[PDB]
Symmetry: C5
Subunit: 311 residues, 5 copies
């Protein structure tokens, strides 16, 4: 088997169509997602053309090994795609209609800067290395690009599945390569984050600040320290569901900033006691009384500043 | 090999049948379950007709590669099917009796709204893409649809295994497709949740309320804060056995509501001390005396309201 | 290839031999165990018979594809058995001696009611679906059933490996099926449970009870609350090494009952302080003094009752 | 293909030799290790002999399927060997020189009695089942047995890789079997255990006892109970990196013995307070003054006794 | 198929080239990384030479099975090569241009001494075993060695991908072997370590030091102990993301040293109380006052010494 010769030198255009059957297993840490889909290919192989009058049949079916098929590969994949050829159909002019069912663990990086309120653009890259005889260019047949209505990605909202119609044609090891970009747009389902991490993390912080209505140093040490240990658990629980980013994340910023509120709360609690012992509970009172307004106002403003910077 | 030609203008009806051998590994987080089953197929291929007087035998056995077999695929599956052909048997009229033993990790979404008192409807979808020559329609032979009596799903009760007899016939990429729905109904075994999660969580919550019979602010802070940190452990332990749902769950609601009871108890405990110090233990007494009745009554009513809304 | 025709009506008896080479990876949560073993099969195929004086050789070797071999399958297996044919040997009368080396992750349910002092009966089920021409019945050749002396199952004691000699012959999808039961009896190695989970758990309970010799409410709260949280931590460590059973387990019973001892301890500790504050330390004294004897006696009796009910 | 006939009765001697390329993934819990190695085999097949004069070539290369190769299998392996034939070379007299590159997850039990100061002897067992025509005996060609200098096992020191030259010849299912033993000796790298588990543990114990110089009952509690819990988190961390042994381990012994020091230190702390309250701080003083010498002397002696018994 | 005969004595030079497509999954514990790449090979097989005048074509394409291909293998790999031949192209003089697309989990050891500020040199070793007829030597064609611009390794910075051009030629089991070294240089992205582990760990240590401004032994025990438990949680969280090194790491050093600061702070806190009780709060004051300056100065100096020794 050899590639179809050009009538004229014009390169072979392979019409590509992807149709997602099932979407699943999005790993934030590994920045991977698994997909179950149909891959449709179409090209002109005049060597396979036939007269529909004499041949009787208007369509001819073939086995993969029987005819020439372009080596279309996936760029960003981990597992060896579960390729199962479903159909090969030749028209009278020699237009091959290929369709295979595949599945692969795709490697698309994620941007966690606005996590868990982040949105992503997942990619599926199709590629074709041009052969010695003639060059191969990829094309998108938008008619065969889509996704099924049942398609769901657990804890995410599937917005779009589109294809960057103009392929990125480039040179590699002295040979032409045509790369295509299939983009799956998803937004995160941040609902479960609010009652499981955000609000409990806030309740522990507000419980910590009850130390500004207490004069008991012994009880204040308990109140601020306990809640701090409970904040360490929450910061750890969070960093385990995320990869080690070289940037600060929205949840990451808030969590880190809260460590400072605990640190300053411990300073206030210490000062109050030192002053009490130093027989000047008058200053101790005015510091504590200020902290009562300061801590919530600075926390409310700090969070506005963060949300402003992040969104 | 080519499909069996139609005497008439009718489509080929492929009679399906599934018989679950072993059911196992239901992953709540991934919304997957694994299954070990028999897949039985039957169609009429008149090209395979024989005379048992000449052929000698009354039934003829074949290898999968030897004869035409319809490309029946599973829609919602992760791993490639562990397909092992057990039997292919042709009758003199040309009725092929196919039977394969398979196993697959099926992707069926779960509804956790009433968890752990939830019930599910797991699905197995069979599909067949119609070929160029003639269309293919799926059918259910209820005689070969079932499950073995030993079939057990750890921590679940297997109610039914039925098949939506009318196949969903639809168009896809200019071709006819016949989809079938096999439904496995299961109810959760919530027994182990009561002494491991629910009762221990109520014990720690009731322990926290002993602070309504204590005047020791220092001991109260220990009681109310310690139990709250134990409650945080349960909230984390629970959310690890579940996926991040865009809705509130029954256990999720209760556990979140309990965070407010800890928050208000911390307020009461603070108030009591502030008033004690402010030399008015008279008001402090009446607040604590109310909180003794209030906390259990509001918790009892709140839970009735939740259970009402969820069931 | 076709099955061996019967001299008479009688079904073909296939002699089954199962022999364990290596036993490993028993998963309590998944109720699975992996096995490395030899599967020996023997049947009479008169079509393969030969004269030993004329053929010279007394025994003739064959390739699996060359001769007819009965489709013997495993019922309770997860991943397709790693079948490697070791030997096929035909005798002069036509007695085929088959031997394959396999490995599989077997699905046998476990009874955790007496955990970690439980014993199990693991099963390996062989099955054969009867063909159109003649029925197939399984048989146990006890001479080729066993296990190697090195065979060890980590954290378990291997008692027996026997076979239920009478096969369960039954109808399924209009065809005869002969099922065989290979039983591997194992008892748990509960030694490591005593100094790692049982004894540390009792020390924290007895430490909790030192509050019956303390009048310091603040120290008692710190005492009983600390140890309650350590017991929560053990209840969690235990439930992670076990599946969610719809029944109570021996360790499960004890651990749940202990929560009540902690709950009543907290009540006692509260009562003592309430009475102390109420200026009647006389009753407070008699309550703690009773609790001193009551708590250990009721715990000792309760455990006798549990052990009685469970064994 | 059939085995090489004997000139005489003599059994066929197959000369083995393993050469470890890469050693890795030693799982203590599963008692498995993975290996990447060369397997070299050599036997005399006179049917393959040739004259080096007329043939021209002094060596002839063959494909595995072309010539008879002895069924050499691994006994203690989990996943089917990644066998890749590298070379088959026949000499003029008919001496076949076989070499394959393999990789397997090997199952060799481990002895944790002296953990983490333990040493192991990992095994790789080669086996050959004798055929109907003639018996097969294994042999070690020490010239082709070894390991590469780069070979490293993470967290272990590779001492030796030797072979038990005399094969264990025995009967199994009426047939002769020749088993060979390849032994890989390794010693554990216990360095990381000292600053991460041993030393941090000794400190929470020394802190646990600063409660022998304090008369404050509350502080002692927190100080010895505190302190104690930290050692419950340390106990769980060690038992998660180890399987459930039916014997006591060195680290296991030490950790368990500390649970008694913590228990007796809580008794001492209770006694001191009871006596203080009972208005006899004179006895309370003499008990605590003794504790301060007793606890460290008994701990120092106890550890000597343990180390003596374990090494 | 047989190797290409030498014109002369000279050995066959195989020109290698690796091109990383996708780099991913770097496991610190397992010291492995996964790679998706192109492997290009080139050698002179004069048996395949042809005249470009009469043959018409410039280049001739071949199937892997049709022509002789050198057995190039990877040394340090865990996963079987996902070899997919993309192109085989013969020039008129007989220069074969081979190109395959592969993927493998590579085993390259990591040096954690400067962790998380460490840099690594990952290796990919190509090897070729010389055949009976003629020896094979590897060579680097630097033109086909590289990496794509999109290539990203999560939490790492990819510096270089170079090849040690001179192959390590050595003897093994009486045969010549040519080994090549492909080096991938990476530096760690330590950003996320600073607000998630380093800074929190320091806030808790400084919180512990507020006990040098407190006279409340009861409150001091809560402080130095609660913060010690937090420091255990951080040592645990850290040692779980790392393998058990036989050396001290930078983070490991700091963490261990901080234990001593907690231990000495507990001694100080004890001394202060003992002296207070011993009715000499004068010495207790001077110890506490020194400790105020001592602890931060000694910690600041100790860290300078560590950083000096480690970098
Ligand atoms: Na306390």
């Amino acid at each position: 088997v050899s590639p179809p010769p050009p009538i004229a030198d014009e390169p072979l255009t392979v019409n590509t169509g992807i149709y997602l059957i099932e979407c699943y297993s999005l790993d934030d840490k590994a920045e991977t997602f698994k997909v179950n889909a149909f891959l449709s290919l179409s090209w002109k192989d005049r060597r396979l053309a036939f007269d529909p009058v004499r041949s009787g049949v208007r369509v001819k079916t073939y086995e993969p090994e029987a005819i020439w098929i372009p080596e279309i590969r996936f760029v960003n994949v981990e597992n060896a795609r579960d390729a199962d050829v479903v159909d090969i159909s030749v028209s009278p002019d020699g237009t091959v209609q290929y369709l295979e069912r595949f599945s692969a663990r795709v490697l698309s990086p994620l941007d966690f800067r606005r996590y868990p309120f982040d949105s992503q653009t997942l990619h599926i890259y199709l590629i074709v290395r041009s052969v010695d005889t003639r060059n191969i260019v990829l094309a998108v047949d938008l008619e065969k690009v889509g996704k099924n209505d049942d398609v769901f990605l657990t804890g995410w909202d599937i917005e779009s599945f589109t294809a960057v119609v103009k392929p990125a044609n480039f040179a590699l090891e002295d040979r032409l390569e045509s790369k295509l970009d299939y983009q799956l747009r998803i937004s995160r389902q941040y609902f479960s984050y609010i009652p499981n991490i955000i609000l409990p993390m806030l309740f522990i912080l507000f419980i910590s600040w009850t130390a500004f209505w207490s004069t008991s140093y012994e009880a204040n040490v308990t109140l601020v320290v306990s809640t701090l240990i409970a904040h360490i658990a929450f910061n750890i629980l969070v960093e385990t569901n995320l990869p080690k980013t070289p940037y600060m994340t929205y949840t990451g910023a808030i969590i880190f900033m809260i460590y400072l509120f605990y640190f300053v709360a411990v300073i206030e609690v210490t000062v109050q006691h030192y002053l009490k012992v130093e027989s000047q509970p008058a200053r101790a009172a005015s510091i504590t009384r200020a902290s009562r307004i300061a801590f919530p106002v600075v926390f409310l403003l700090a969070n506005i500043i963060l949300a402003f910077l992040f969104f």
